[PDB]
Design a protein around this ligand. Structure first.
Ligand SMILES: *C/C=C(C)/C=C/C=C(C)/C=C/C1=C(C)CCCC1(C)C
Ligand SMILES: CCCCCCCCCC
Ligand SMILES: CCCCCCCCCC
Ligand SMILES: CCCCCCCCCC
Ligand SMILES: CCCCCC
Ligand SMILES: CCCCCC
Ligand SMILES: CCCCCC
Ligand SMILES: CCCCCC
Ligand SMILES: [Br-]
Ligand SMILES: [Br-]
Ligand SMILES: [Br-]
Length: 265
């Protein structure tokens, strides 16, 4: 049960573009990691964990993007005018394993800026993480068959989509029922984060389906391109909005370092 990446030889332009996409993603996440670390001091204690979760996400994704980059250059060699598969192996499956950690972190930092606490926070986080883990795990099993069994990729993806929809319903319901509690005008900002999340996370099932409608070397490139757009949107851009909401609410709650931080800009 191979992946479609192992099926093709690659032109130098295709190979280097994919490598440059992954290495670019590493640099963006580690550059954002520094930003999230420095602005941590400008967030009130109640919200500071949300910015720390951005730091964990940046290193988690950055390590897996660097991992994918070197595996790409390990597994292929330029022979007779094209990059051909060598002794080693490349696989998008390590992305799925990493999602088991990064997705709960992304969801947790949203619940924190929604001002959920105590029993409701733990309760809502447990249902969301369980739904997300069911989405990822059924998706992982599905892509094992992206070459061998296209019908199984479809059926496991339908199961995965059911968890995805239920997960989004919980997220959206909590957002619209707790919007009134949010400070500094961030009741307007949080609805924008929900829509950004809808857009960015939907890119992943689209990349999952690439083997069904573009099973060639250019579809390998398009999938990595979609992953890159989705990774930056769902982690970096999303994290900046979460951090903005965290600081804005900190300032409205009387945190002086937050108020000063916004004043200078
Ligand atoms: C930073 C990485 C993120 C936010 C990854 C998100 C992943 C998903 C939303 C996964 C979606 C899937 C389905 C809805 C159906 C097909 C299989 C998956 C696992 C790709
Ligand atoms: C600003 C510190 C970010 C530097 C990123 C390092 C890129 C490593 C590419 C292998
Ligand atoms: C207030 C407790 C949060 C529960 C929201 C809905 C959970 C989904 C059960 C599937
Ligand atoms: C289709 C997944 C979208 C779920 C959003 C529902 C939010 C409305 C709650 C009032
Ligand atoms: C060996 C492929 C990577 C999957 C990790 C469980
Ligand atoms: C997998 C089909 C679910 C769609 C529900 C809106
Ligand atoms: C035009 C690109 C918008 C980026 C905002 C973060
Ligand atoms: C310096 C706080 C602003 C964060 C959002 C870009
Ligand atoms: Br506080
Ligand atoms: Br990730
Ligand atoms: Br409602």
């Amino acid at each position: 049960m191979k992946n479609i990446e192992s099926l093709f030889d690659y032109s130098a332009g295709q190979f280097e573009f994919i490598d440059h996409l992954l290495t670019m993603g590493v640099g963006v996440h580690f550059a954002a990691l520094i930003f999230f670390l420095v602005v941590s001091q400008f967030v009130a204690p109640k919200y500071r964990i949300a910015t720390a979760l951005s730091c964990i996400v940046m290193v988690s994704a950055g390590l897996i993007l660097n991992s994918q980059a070197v595996m790409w250059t390990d597994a292929y060699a330029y022979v007779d005018g094209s990059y051909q598969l060598q002794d080693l192996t490349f696989s998008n499956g390590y992305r799925y394993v990493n999602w088991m950690a990064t997705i709960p972190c992304l969801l947790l930092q949203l619940l924190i800026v929604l001002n959920l606490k105590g029993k409701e926070l733990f309760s809502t986080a447990t249902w969301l993480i369980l739904a997300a883990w069911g989405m990822i795990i059924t998706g992982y099993v599905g892509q094992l068959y992206e070459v061998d069994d296209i019908a199984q990729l479809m059926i496991w993806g339908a199961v995965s989509t059911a968890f995805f929809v239920v997960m989004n319903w919980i997220v959206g319901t909590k957002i619209f029922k707790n919007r009134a509690t949010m400070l500094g005008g961030t009741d307007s900002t949080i609805t924008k984060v929900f829509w950004l999340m809808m857009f960015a996370w939907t890119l992943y099932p689209i990349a999952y389906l690439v083997p069904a409608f573009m099973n060639n070397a250019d579809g390998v490139v398009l999938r990595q391109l979609l992953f890159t757009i989705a990774d930056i949107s769902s982690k970096v851009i999303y994290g900046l909005m979460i951090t903005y909401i965290a600081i804005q609410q900190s300032a409205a709650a009387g945190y002086v370092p937050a108020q000063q931080a916004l004043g200078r800009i």
